[PDB]
Amino acid sequence: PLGSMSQSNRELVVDFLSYKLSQKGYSWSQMAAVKQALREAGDEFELRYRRAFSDLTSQLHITPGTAYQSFEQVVNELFRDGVNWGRIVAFFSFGGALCVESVDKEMQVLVSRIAAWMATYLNDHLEPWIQENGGWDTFVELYG
Amino acid sequence: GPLGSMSQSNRELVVDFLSYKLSQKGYSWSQMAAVKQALREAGDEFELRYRRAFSDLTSQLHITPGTAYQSFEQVVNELFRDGVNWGRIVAFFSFGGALCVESVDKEMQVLVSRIAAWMATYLNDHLEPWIQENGGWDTFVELYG
Ligand SMILES: O=C(Nc1nc2ccccc2s1)c1cccc2c1CN(c1nc(C(=O)O)c(CCCOc3ccc(-n4ncc5cncnc54)cc3)s1)CC2
Ligand SMILES: O=C(Nc1nc2ccccc2s1)c1cccc2c1CN(c1nc(C(=O)O)c(CCCOc3ccc(-n4ncc5cncnc54)cc3)s1)CC2
């Protein structure tokens, strides 16, 4: 495709510059700052806290037959006692784990399905809370 | 804002987060996944051990809000005056990174977007032909990854 080099060079430059900015405590953009805080929070969640909780991947046991309804019910369990930032981090980590598991099990088509599930769940179930509780900028202040 | 206004941002978070988690397990959301990581690591190594040996290109550019691509190109050409190799391309990226940091330091944050565009332009005009004849970025990854 004619515009394929534009997209990949942009991607490369922005990634490198965003990385160098972050190393000095700066951000390419406010969205870059949220992405970075969420990446790091996911890492911290996985390193220290995932172990404490019921394994959501065991509750979903994802297969090529799994639809959003099943994902939603399992994620509803995560937020059964309410939403907070930590549980939102767990939600992202869960989606990440599902994608890795899928590729591991040679079900790569599920990665696109899972991404679509996450966006829909964010939209339908989490955006009201995120907005009511100070938005992603507040997450960055707390978890960055 | 009205419900629905956060959709695009939240979608970006999903794509970024999943790409990150996949990359940690050696999988690639994007085709550029290996290249990005290799370039990050190379930039770090250049800055830690090799930058010190060379003429400071940020001093040669002394970037201001009035700086235009021409001045940037003149300074980067100095880097490649004696030819292109991968190490000097890493130095080019490191130089762009340092310019962005300096711009933010000096409250000229507007230059960051400008620098990114300059780097794309320089890459396209001067380096991309060399990169393609020297095995492409895939070859960079095997050499510097
Ligand atoms: O999570 C669950 N199950 C998972 N199964 C998998 C499987 C695969 C992958 C992921 C998961 S998650 C689960 C399942 C069923 C029910 C419930 C859960 C999770 N609940 C949780 N409550 C809380 C809570 O504080 O109230 C959770 C958050 C724990 C704390 O976190 C973090 C803490 C700190 C950070 N930080 N970083 C950077 C940083 C900087 N400063 C300060 N804190 C920081 C990040 C995460 S989480 C309760 C309900
Ligand atoms: O660079 C210059 N000036 C800078 N000023 C700033 C200011 C701010 C920020 C950045 C810079 S850079 C400069 C200025 C004027 C003229 C010239 C230069 C730079 N020249 C250079 N020649 C060479 C060369 O080997 O031939 C350069 C590369 C040096 C070595 O590298 C690396 C070496 C190793 C790695 N690696 N990692 C990981 C890794 C894994 N495997 C193998 N190598 C690896 C990365 C970079 S670089 C010569 C001309």
mmCIF file of C-alpha atoms and ligand atoms in Angstrom:
data_model
loop_
_atom_site.group_PDB
_atom_site.id
_atom_site.type_symbol
_atom_site.label_atom_id
_atom_site.label_comp_id
_atom_site.label_asym_id
_atom_site.label_seq_id
_atom_site.Cartn_x
_atom_site.Cartn_y
_atom_site.Cartn_z
ATOM 1 C CA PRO A 1 0.000 0.000 0.000
ATOM 2 C CA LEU A 2 1.147 3.543 -0.852
ATOM 3 C CA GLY A 3 0.792 4.888 2.679
ATOM 4 C CA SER A 4 2.386 2.007 4.550
ATOM 5 C CA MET A 5 5.760 3.707 5.048
ATOM 6 C CA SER A 6 4.110 6.869 6.387
ATOM 7 C CA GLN A 7 2.366 4.800 9.033
ATOM 8 C CA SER A 8 5.385 2.768 10.138
ATOM 9 C CA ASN A 9 7.924 5.594 10.179
ATOM 10 C CA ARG A 10 5.501 7.716 12.175
ATOM 11 C CA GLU A 11 5.005 4.801 14.544
ATOM 12 C CA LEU A 12 8.750 4.321 14.972
ATOM 13 C CA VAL A 13 9.632 7.978 15.504
ATOM 14 C CA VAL A 14 6.793 8.604 17.922
ATOM 15 C CA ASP A 15 7.630 5.460 19.880
ATOM 16 C CA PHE A 16 11.279 6.418 20.235
ATOM 17 C CA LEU A 17 10.576 10.056 21.112
ATOM 18 C CA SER A 18 7.773 9.107 23.528
ATOM 19 C CA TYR A 19 10.185 6.692 25.230
ATOM 20 C CA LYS A 20 12.967 9.294 25.527
ATOM 21 C CA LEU A 21 10.545 11.886 26.856
ATOM 22 C CA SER A 22 9.187 9.477 29.466
ATOM 23 C CA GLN A 23 12.695 8.687 30.702
ATOM 24 C CA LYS A 24 13.007 12.327 31.732
ATOM 25 C CA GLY A 25 9.561 12.324 33.307
ATOM 26 C CA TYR A 26 7.985 14.061 30.301
ATOM 27 C CA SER A 27 5.205 12.879 27.977
ATOM 28 C CA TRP A 28 4.699 12.974 24.214
ATOM 29 C CA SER A 29 1.016 13.634 24.870
ATOM 30 C CA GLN A 30 -1.456 13.430 27.725
ATOM 31 C CA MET A 31 -2.682 10.164 26.163
ATOM 32 C CA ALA A 32 0.926 8.912 26.081
ATOM 33 C CA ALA A 33 1.060 9.638 29.820
ATOM 34 C CA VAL A 34 -2.083 7.584 30.462
ATOM 35 C CA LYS A 35 -0.826 4.710 28.299
ATOM 36 C CA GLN A 36 2.471 4.683 30.165
ATOM 37 C CA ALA A 37 0.817 4.810 33.610
ATOM 38 C CA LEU A 38 -1.555 1.989 32.647
ATOM 39 C CA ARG A 39 1.288 -0.145 31.222
ATOM 40 C CA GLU A 40 3.254 0.265 34.444
ATOM 41 C CA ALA A 41 0.185 -0.364 36.624
ATOM 42 C CA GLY A 42 -0.538 -3.547 34.667
ATOM 43 C CA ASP A 43 3.049 -4.674 35.247
ATOM 44 C CA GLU A 44 2.821 -3.893 38.967
ATOM 45 C CA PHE A 45 -0.567 -5.611 39.233
ATOM 46 C CA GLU A 46 0.783 -8.747 37.540
ATOM 47 C CA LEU A 47 4.004 -8.736 39.562
ATOM 48 C CA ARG A 48 2.490 -8.301 43.006
ATOM 49 C CA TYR A 49 -1.250 -8.539 43.169
ATOM 50 C CA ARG A 50 -2.790 -10.887 40.551
ATOM 51 C CA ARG A 51 -1.815 -13.831 42.783
ATOM 52 C CA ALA A 52 -4.308 -12.764 45.469
ATOM 53 C CA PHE A 53 -7.396 -13.141 43.313
ATOM 54 C CA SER A 54 -9.608 -15.732 41.683
ATOM 55 C CA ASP A 55 -8.158 -16.462 38.230
ATOM 56 C CA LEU A 56 -10.540 -14.833 35.727
ATOM 57 C CA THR A 57 -9.006 -16.801 32.854
ATOM 58 C CA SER A 58 -10.119 -19.974 34.618
ATOM 59 C CA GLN A 59 -13.644 -18.568 34.945
ATOM 60 C CA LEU A 60 -13.881 -17.749 31.220
ATOM 61 C CA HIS A 61 -11.965 -20.730 29.797
ATOM 62 C CA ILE A 62 -11.910 -18.977 26.444
ATOM 63 C CA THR A 63 -12.481 -21.016 23.249
ATOM 64 C CA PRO A 64 -13.295 -20.120 19.626
ATOM 65 C CA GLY A 65 -16.952 -20.353 20.708
ATOM 66 C CA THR A 66 -16.708 -17.655 23.398
ATOM 67 C CA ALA A 67 -18.835 -14.536 22.779
ATOM 68 C CA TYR A 68 -18.984 -11.152 24.498
ATOM 69 C CA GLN A 69 -21.780 -12.328 26.812
ATOM 70 C CA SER A 70 -19.385 -14.754 28.523
ATOM 71 C CA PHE A 71 -16.562 -12.225 28.769
ATOM 72 C CA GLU A 72 -18.990 -9.672 30.199
ATOM 73 C CA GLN A 73 -20.302 -12.074 32.884
ATOM 74 C CA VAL A 74 -16.755 -12.902 34.012
ATOM 75 C CA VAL A 75 -15.697 -9.260 34.050
ATOM 76 C CA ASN A 76 -18.902 -8.379 35.927
ATOM 77 C CA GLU A 77 -17.538 -10.704 38.618
ATOM 78 C CA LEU A 78 -14.369 -8.588 38.815
ATOM 79 C CA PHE A 79 -16.507 -5.509 39.447
ATOM 80 C CA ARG A 80 -19.151 -7.266 41.551
ATOM 81 C CA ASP A 81 -18.330 -5.181 44.621
ATOM 82 C CA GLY A 82 -17.823 -1.980 42.673
ATOM 83 C CA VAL A 83 -15.351 -0.275 40.361
ATOM 84 C CA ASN A 84 -12.042 1.197 41.474
ATOM 85 C CA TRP A 85 -8.818 1.987 39.603
ATOM 86 C CA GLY A 86 -7.097 -1.181 40.774
ATOM 87 C CA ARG A 87 -9.930 -3.315 39.369
ATOM 88 C CA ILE A 88 -9.749 -1.391 36.121
ATOM 89 C CA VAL A 89 -6.042 -2.253 35.984
ATOM 90 C CA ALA A 90 -6.973 -5.910 36.656
ATOM 91 C CA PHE A 91 -9.469 -5.748 33.770
ATOM 92 C CA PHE A 92 -6.751 -4.619 31.332
ATOM 93 C CA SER A 93 -4.369 -7.236 32.685
ATOM 94 C CA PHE A 94 -7.088 -9.872 32.201
ATOM 95 C CA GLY A 95 -7.631 -8.858 28.570
ATOM 96 C CA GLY A 96 -3.873 -8.973 28.071
ATOM 97 C CA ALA A 97 -3.701 -12.441 29.567
ATOM 98 C CA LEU A 98 -6.541 -13.650 27.348
ATOM 99 C CA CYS A 99 -4.696 -12.441 24.261
ATOM 100 C CA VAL A 100 -1.457 -14.121 25.262
ATOM 101 C CA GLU A 101 -3.308 -17.344 26.088
ATOM 102 C CA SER A 102 -5.076 -17.255 22.734
ATOM 103 C CA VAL A 103 -1.875 -16.833 20.744
ATOM 104 C CA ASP A 104 -0.190 -19.504 22.869
ATOM 105 C CA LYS A 105 -3.025 -21.891 21.969
ATOM 106 C CA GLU A 106 -2.850 -20.955 18.286
ATOM 107 C CA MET A 107 -6.207 -19.167 18.381
ATOM 108 C CA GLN A 108 -4.839 -15.846 17.122
ATOM 109 C CA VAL A 109 -8.178 -14.786 15.657
ATOM 110 C CA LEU A 110 -9.418 -14.285 19.231
ATOM 111 C CA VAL A 111 -7.067 -11.347 19.814
ATOM 112 C CA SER A 112 -9.231 -9.131 17.605
ATOM 113 C CA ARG A 113 -12.365 -10.469 19.336
ATOM 114 C CA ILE A 114 -10.966 -9.761 22.806
ATOM 115 C CA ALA A 115 -9.917 -6.217 21.873
ATOM 116 C CA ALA A 116 -13.454 -5.538 20.643
ATOM 117 C CA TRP A 117 -14.863 -6.994 23.878
ATOM 118 C CA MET A 118 -12.680 -4.721 25.977
ATOM 119 C CA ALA A 119 -13.665 -1.556 24.147
ATOM 120 C CA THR A 120 -17.363 -2.423 24.386
ATOM 121 C CA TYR A 121 -17.071 -3.264 28.072
ATOM 122 C CA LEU A 122 -15.191 0.013 28.735
ATOM 123 C CA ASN A 123 -17.833 1.952 26.845
ATOM 124 C CA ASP A 124 -20.885 0.301 28.319
ATOM 125 C CA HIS A 125 -19.798 -0.477 31.870
ATOM 126 C CA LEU A 126 -16.781 1.603 32.890
ATOM 127 C CA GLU A 127 -16.891 4.991 31.210
ATOM 128 C CA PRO A 128 -19.495 6.381 33.639
ATOM 129 C CA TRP A 129 -17.280 5.463 36.598
ATOM 130 C CA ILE A 130 -14.097 6.742 34.958
ATOM 131 C CA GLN A 131 -15.709 10.073 34.241
ATOM 132 C CA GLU A 132 -17.291 10.348 37.687
ATOM 133 C CA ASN A 133 -14.048 9.574 39.398
ATOM 134 C CA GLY A 134 -11.854 12.142 37.763
ATOM 135 C CA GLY A 135 -11.023 10.620 34.383
ATOM 136 C CA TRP A 136 -7.773 9.056 33.212
ATOM 137 C CA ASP A 137 -5.885 12.200 34.214
ATOM 138 C CA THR A 138 -6.709 11.325 37.826
ATOM 139 C CA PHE A 139 -5.552 7.749 37.263
ATOM 140 C CA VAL A 140 -2.207 9.151 36.083
ATOM 141 C CA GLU A 141 -1.955 11.321 39.195
ATOM 142 C CA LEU A 142 -2.569 8.277 41.383
ATOM 143 C CA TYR A 143 -0.740 5.492 39.500
ATOM 144 C CA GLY A 144 1.885 7.358 37.499
ATOM 145 C CA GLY B 1 -18.592 14.791 29.010
ATOM 146 C CA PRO B 2 -21.621 12.974 27.637
ATOM 147 C CA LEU B 3 -21.319 9.210 27.695
ATOM 148 C CA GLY B 4 -19.718 8.184 24.475
ATOM 149 C CA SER B 5 -17.111 10.956 24.548
ATOM 150 C CA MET B 6 -14.480 8.673 26.099
ATOM 151 C CA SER B 7 -14.830 5.862 23.532
ATOM 152 C CA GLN B 8 -11.957 6.799 21.259
ATOM 153 C CA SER B 9 -9.518 7.298 24.155
ATOM 154 C CA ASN B 10 -10.521 4.070 25.829
ATOM 155 C CA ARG B 11 -10.083 2.181 22.565
ATOM 156 C CA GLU B 12 -6.552 3.584 22.225
ATOM 157 C CA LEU B 13 -5.831 2.334 25.764
ATOM 158 C CA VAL B 14 -7.014 -1.145 24.828
ATOM 159 C CA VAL B 15 -4.869 -1.314 21.700
ATOM 160 C CA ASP B 16 -1.824 0.102 23.457
ATOM 161 C CA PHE B 17 -2.113 -2.159 26.494
ATOM 162 C CA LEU B 18 -2.685 -5.358 24.541
ATOM 163 C CA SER B 19 0.189 -4.512 22.187
ATOM 164 C CA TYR B 20 2.456 -4.025 25.220
ATOM 165 C CA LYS B 21 1.437 -7.279 26.928
ATOM 166 C CA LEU B 22 1.784 -9.242 23.704
ATOM 167 C CA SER B 23 5.250 -7.780 23.091
ATOM 168 C CA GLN B 24 6.384 -8.841 26.572
ATOM 169 C CA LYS B 25 5.673 -12.437 25.551
ATOM 170 C CA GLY B 26 7.452 -12.015 22.238
ATOM 171 C CA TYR B 27 4.324 -11.467 20.150
ATOM 172 C CA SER B 28 3.775 -8.549 17.776
ATOM 173 C CA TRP B 29 0.605 -6.497 17.612
ATOM 174 C CA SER B 30 2.370 -4.314 15.070
ATOM 175 C CA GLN B 31 4.882 -5.215 12.386
ATOM 176 C CA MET B 32 7.218 -2.599 13.841
ATOM 177 C CA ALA B 33 7.182 -4.261 17.296
ATOM 178 C CA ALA B 34 10.695 -5.783 17.170
ATOM 179 C CA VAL B 35 12.168 -2.666 15.568
ATOM 180 C CA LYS B 36 10.787 -0.305 18.205
ATOM 181 C CA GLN B 37 12.198 -2.347 21.071
ATOM 182 C CA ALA B 38 15.568 -2.820 19.407
ATOM 183 C CA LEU B 39 15.778 0.893 18.666
ATOM 184 C CA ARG B 40 14.827 1.847 22.256
ATOM 185 C CA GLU B 41 17.539 -0.415 23.628
ATOM 186 C CA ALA B 42 20.119 0.855 21.116
ATOM 187 C CA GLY B 43 19.294 4.478 21.910
ATOM 188 C CA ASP B 44 19.852 3.683 25.610
ATOM 189 C CA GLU B 45 23.207 2.025 24.897
ATOM 190 C CA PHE B 46 24.359 4.875 22.651
ATOM 191 C CA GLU B 47 23.510 7.494 25.248
ATOM 192 C CA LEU B 48 25.063 5.518 28.082
ATOM 193 C CA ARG B 49 28.412 4.692 26.493
ATOM 194 C CA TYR B 50 29.044 6.419 23.161
ATOM 195 C CA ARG B 51 27.352 9.859 22.924
ATOM 196 C CA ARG B 52 30.106 11.320 25.113
ATOM 197 C CA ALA B 53 32.709 10.795 22.373
ATOM 198 C CA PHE B 54 31.051 13.014 19.825
ATOM 199 C CA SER B 55 30.407 16.652 19.028
ATOM 200 C CA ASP B 56 27.173 17.651 20.765
ATOM 201 C CA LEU B 57 24.664 18.117 17.952
ATOM 202 C CA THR B 58 22.195 19.897 20.262
ATOM 203 C CA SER B 59 24.818 22.639 20.644
ATOM 204 C CA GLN B 60 25.174 22.860 16.871
ATOM 205 C CA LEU B 61 21.446 23.308 16.363
ATOM 206 C CA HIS B 62 20.684 25.391 19.477
ATOM 207 C CA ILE B 63 17.029 24.831 18.765
ATOM 208 C CA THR B 64 14.538 27.692 19.231
ATOM 209 C CA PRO B 65 10.898 28.222 18.162
ATOM 210 C CA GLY B 66 12.328 29.809 15.025
ATOM 211 C CA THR B 67 14.203 26.684 14.022
ATOM 212 C CA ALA B 68 13.069 25.237 10.704
ATOM 213 C CA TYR B 69 13.851 21.928 9.005
ATOM 214 C CA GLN B 70 16.773 23.421 7.086
ATOM 215 C CA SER B 71 18.828 23.972 10.233
ATOM 216 C CA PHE B 72 17.974 20.487 11.500
ATOM 217 C CA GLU B 73 18.992 18.923 8.194
ATOM 218 C CA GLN B 74 22.331 20.813 8.188
ATOM 219 C CA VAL B 75 23.166 19.482 11.634
ATOM 220 C CA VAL B 76 22.039 15.919 10.950
ATOM 221 C CA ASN B 77 24.059 15.930 7.687
ATOM 222 C CA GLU B 78 27.078 16.520 9.884
ATOM 223 C CA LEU B 79 26.309 13.196 11.591
ATOM 224 C CA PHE B 80 26.293 11.350 8.229
ATOM 225 C CA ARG B 81 28.987 13.447 6.568
ATOM 226 C CA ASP B 82 31.298 10.432 6.285
ATOM 227 C CA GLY B 83 28.563 7.956 5.358
ATOM 228 C CA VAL B 84 25.622 6.064 6.812
ATOM 229 C CA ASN B 85 25.768 3.120 9.197
ATOM 230 C CA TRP B 86 23.365 1.717 11.802
ATOM 231 C CA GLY B 87 25.211 3.276 14.737
ATOM 232 C CA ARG B 88 24.850 6.748 13.245
ATOM 233 C CA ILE B 89 21.168 6.099 12.608
ATOM 234 C CA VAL B 90 20.833 5.226 16.294
ATOM 235 C CA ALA B 91 22.682 8.485 17.031
ATOM 236 C CA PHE B 92 20.136 10.293 14.788
ATOM 237 C CA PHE B 93 17.212 8.955 16.841
ATOM 238 C CA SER B 94 19.022 9.729 20.091
ATOM 239 C CA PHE B 95 19.608 13.265 18.794
ATOM 240 C CA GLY B 96 15.883 13.662 18.033
ATOM 241 C CA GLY B 97 15.060 12.398 21.528
ATOM 242 C CA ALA B 98 17.466 14.843 23.138
ATOM 243 C CA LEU B 99 16.005 17.740 21.121
ATOM 244 C CA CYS B 100 12.532 16.860 22.359
ATOM 245 C CA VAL B 101 13.692 16.755 25.987
ATOM 246 C CA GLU B 102 15.504 20.097 25.575
ATOM 247 C CA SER B 103 12.427 21.658 23.982
ATOM 248 C CA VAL B 104 10.273 20.694 26.956
ATOM 249 C CA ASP B 105 13.016 21.856 29.357
ATOM 250 C CA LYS B 106 13.032 25.289 27.730
ATOM 251 C CA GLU B 107 9.223 25.570 27.562
ATOM 252 C CA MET B 108 9.144 25.170 23.773
ATOM 253 C CA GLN B 109 6.945 22.065 23.789
ATOM 254 C CA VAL B 110 5.640 23.030 20.327
ATOM 255 C CA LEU B 111 8.960 21.862 18.894
ATOM 256 C CA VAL B 112 8.337 18.223 19.848
ATOM 257 C CA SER B 113 5.788 17.695 17.072
ATOM 258 C CA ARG B 114 8.033 19.628 14.692
ATOM 259 C CA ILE B 115 11.046 17.460 15.521
ATOM 260 C CA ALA B 116 9.048 14.290 14.936
ATOM 261 C CA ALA B 117 8.089 15.568 11.479
ATOM 262 C CA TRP B 118 11.696 16.585 10.698
ATOM 263 C CA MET B 119 12.904 13.123 11.625
ATOM 264 C CA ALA B 120 10.305 11.531 9.313
ATOM 265 C CA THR B 121 11.322 13.864 6.510
ATOM 266 C CA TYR B 122 15.032 13.195 7.029
ATOM 267 C CA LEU B 123 14.425 9.450 7.256
ATOM 268 C CA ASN B 124 12.470 9.510 3.974
ATOM 269 C CA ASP B 125 14.812 11.852 2.104
ATOM 270 C CA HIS B 126 18.227 10.593 3.173
ATOM 271 C CA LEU B 127 18.211 7.320 5.089
ATOM 272 C CA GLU B 128 15.462 5.156 3.675
ATOM 273 C CA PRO B 129 17.354 4.344 0.467
ATOM 274 C CA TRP B 130 20.375 3.217 2.522
ATOM 275 C CA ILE B 131 18.220 1.235 4.971
ATOM 276 C CA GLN B 132 16.546 -0.702 2.156
ATOM 277 C CA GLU B 133 19.860 -1.605 0.504
ATOM 278 C CA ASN B 134 21.368 -2.679 3.834
ATOM 279 C CA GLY B 135 18.729 -5.246 4.743
ATOM 280 C CA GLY B 136 15.997 -3.021 6.141
ATOM 281 C CA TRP B 137 15.001 -2.577 9.780
ATOM 282 C CA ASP B 138 14.760 -6.359 10.165
ATOM 283 C CA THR B 139 18.523 -6.439 9.692
ATOM 284 C CA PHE B 140 18.920 -3.702 12.290
ATOM 285 C CA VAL B 141 16.961 -5.836 14.765
ATOM 286 C CA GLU B 142 19.129 -8.914 14.274
ATOM 287 C CA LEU B 143 22.299 -6.787 14.650
ATOM 288 C CA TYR B 144 21.237 -4.521 17.523
ATOM 289 C CA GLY B 145 18.529 -6.536 19.250
HETATM 290 O O1 LIG C 1 -8.571 -9.588 39.475
HETATM 291 C C1 LIG C 1 -9.195 -10.619 39.667
HETATM 292 N N1 LIG C 1 -8.799 -11.683 38.964
HETATM 293 C C2 LIG C 1 -7.839 -11.711 38.003
HETATM 294 N N2 LIG C 1 -7.623 -12.813 37.266
HETATM 295 C C3 LIG C 1 -6.715 -12.554 36.285
HETATM 296 C C4 LIG C 1 -6.192 -13.459 35.365
HETATM 297 C C5 LIG C 1 -5.270 -13.028 34.412
HETATM 298 C C6 LIG C 1 -4.864 -11.695 34.356
HETATM 299 C C7 LIG C 1 -5.384 -10.795 35.276
HETATM 300 C C8 LIG C 1 -6.303 -11.227 36.213
HETATM 301 S S1 LIG C 1 -7.032 -10.293 37.413
HETATM 302 C C9 LIG C 1 -10.442 -10.658 40.492
HETATM 303 C C10 LIG C 1 -11.289 -11.731 40.235
HETATM 304 C C11 LIG C 1 -12.531 -11.832 40.849
HETATM 305 C C12 LIG C 1 -12.924 -10.817 41.712
HETATM 306 C C13 LIG C 1 -12.110 -9.712 41.922
HETATM 307 C C14 LIG C 1 -10.862 -9.624 41.322
HETATM 308 C C15 LIG C 1 -9.979 -8.417 41.561
HETATM 309 N N3 LIG C 1 -10.318 -7.593 42.691
HETATM 310 C C16 LIG C 1 -9.499 -6.556 42.945
HETATM 311 N N4 LIG C 1 -9.689 -5.673 43.946
HETATM 312 C C17 LIG C 1 -8.721 -4.739 44.001
HETATM 313 C C18 LIG C 1 -8.787 -3.655 45.035
HETATM 314 O O2 LIG C 1 -7.758 -2.997 45.319
HETATM 315 O O3 LIG C 1 -9.911 -3.407 45.554
HETATM 316 C C19 LIG C 1 -7.758 -4.890 42.993
HETATM 317 C C20 LIG C 1 -6.529 -4.038 42.742
HETATM 318 C C21 LIG C 1 -5.325 -4.552 43.555
HETATM 319 C C22 LIG C 1 -4.222 -3.515 43.619
HETATM 320 O O4 LIG C 1 -3.713 -3.355 42.285
HETATM 321 C C23 LIG C 1 -2.768 -2.428 41.943
HETATM 322 C C24 LIG C 1 -2.162 -1.724 42.984
HETATM 323 C C25 LIG C 1 -1.182 -0.764 42.714
HETATM 324 C C26 LIG C 1 -0.793 -0.528 41.391
HETATM 325 N N5 LIG C 1 0.116 0.393 41.029
HETATM 326 N N6 LIG C 1 0.826 0.374 39.824
HETATM 327 C C27 LIG C 1 1.609 1.469 39.760
HETATM 328 C C28 LIG C 1 1.342 2.196 40.966
HETATM 329 C C29 LIG C 1 1.862 3.400 41.423
HETATM 330 N N7 LIG C 1 1.459 3.890 42.601
HETATM 331 C C30 LIG C 1 0.551 3.190 43.290
HETATM 332 N N8 LIG C 1 0.001 2.030 42.931
HETATM 333 C C31 LIG C 1 0.395 1.503 41.739
HETATM 334 C C32 LIG C 1 -1.405 -1.238 40.365
HETATM 335 C C33 LIG C 1 -2.383 -2.189 40.633
HETATM 336 S S2 LIG C 1 -8.087 -6.255 41.979
HETATM 337 C C34 LIG C 1 -11.428 -7.946 43.565
HETATM 338 C C35 LIG C 1 -12.590 -8.627 42.854
HETATM 339 O O1 LIG C 2 26.554 11.597 17.148
HETATM 340 C C1 LIG C 2 27.123 12.683 17.099
HETATM 341 N N1 LIG C 2 26.713 13.601 17.969
HETATM 342 C C2 LIG C 2 25.674 13.460 18.853
HETATM 343 N N2 LIG C 2 25.262 14.522 19.566
HETATM 344 C C3 LIG C 2 24.150 14.220 20.268
HETATM 345 C C4 LIG C 2 23.492 15.053 21.160
HETATM 346 C C5 LIG C 2 22.350 14.601 21.818
HETATM 347 C C6 LIG C 2 21.864 13.309 21.620
HETATM 348 C C7 LIG C 2 22.527 12.470 20.732
HETATM 349 C C8 LIG C 2 23.680 12.934 20.072
HETATM 350 S S1 LIG C 2 24.628 12.080 18.958
HETATM 351 C C9 LIG C 2 28.071 13.018 15.990
HETATM 352 C C10 LIG C 2 28.232 14.366 15.717
HETATM 353 C C11 LIG C 2 29.013 14.787 14.639
HETATM 354 C C12 LIG C 2 29.573 13.837 13.802
HETATM 355 C C13 LIG C 2 29.355 12.488 14.030
HETATM 356 C C14 LIG C 2 28.602 12.075 15.118
HETATM 357 C C15 LIG C 2 28.395 10.600 15.369
HETATM 358 N N3 LIG C 2 29.283 9.698 14.669
HETATM 359 C C16 LIG C 2 29.109 8.376 14.929
HETATM 360 N N4 LIG C 2 29.847 7.412 14.366
HETATM 361 C C17 LIG C 2 29.517 6.173 14.790
HETATM 362 C C18 LIG C 2 30.229 4.979 14.242
HETATM 363 O O2 LIG C 2 30.285 3.926 14.910
HETATM 364 O O3 LIG C 2 30.729 5.087 13.099
HETATM 365 C C19 LIG C 2 28.470 6.161 15.705
HETATM 366 C C20 LIG C 2 27.868 4.962 16.392
HETATM 367 C C21 LIG C 2 28.636 4.806 17.707
HETATM 368 C C22 LIG C 2 28.338 3.484 18.393
HETATM 369 O O4 LIG C 2 26.944 3.425 18.673
HETATM 370 C C23 LIG C 2 26.248 2.330 19.106
HETATM 371 C C24 LIG C 2 26.993 1.188 19.405
HETATM 372 C C25 LIG C 2 26.351 0.036 19.857
HETATM 373 C C26 LIG C 2 24.966 0.035 20.004
HETATM 374 N N5 LIG C 2 24.287 -1.038 20.425
HETATM 375 N N6 LIG C 2 23.181 -0.992 21.277
HETATM 376 C C27 LIG C 2 22.736 -2.247 21.464
HETATM 377 C C28 LIG C 2 23.602 -3.085 20.684
HETATM 378 C C29 LIG C 2 23.600 -4.465 20.509
HETATM 379 N N7 LIG C 2 24.517 -5.032 19.721
HETATM 380 C C30 LIG C 2 25.405 -4.227 19.134
HETATM 381 N N8 LIG C 2 25.485 -2.899 19.242
HETATM 382 C C31 LIG C 2 24.560 -2.295 20.037
HETATM 383 C C32 LIG C 2 24.233 1.179 19.707
HETATM 384 C C33 LIG C 2 24.867 2.319 19.260
HETATM 385 S S2 LIG C 2 27.917 7.775 16.052
HETATM 386 C C34 LIG C 2 30.335 10.186 13.786
HETATM 387 C C35 LIG C 2 29.996 11.495 13.093
#
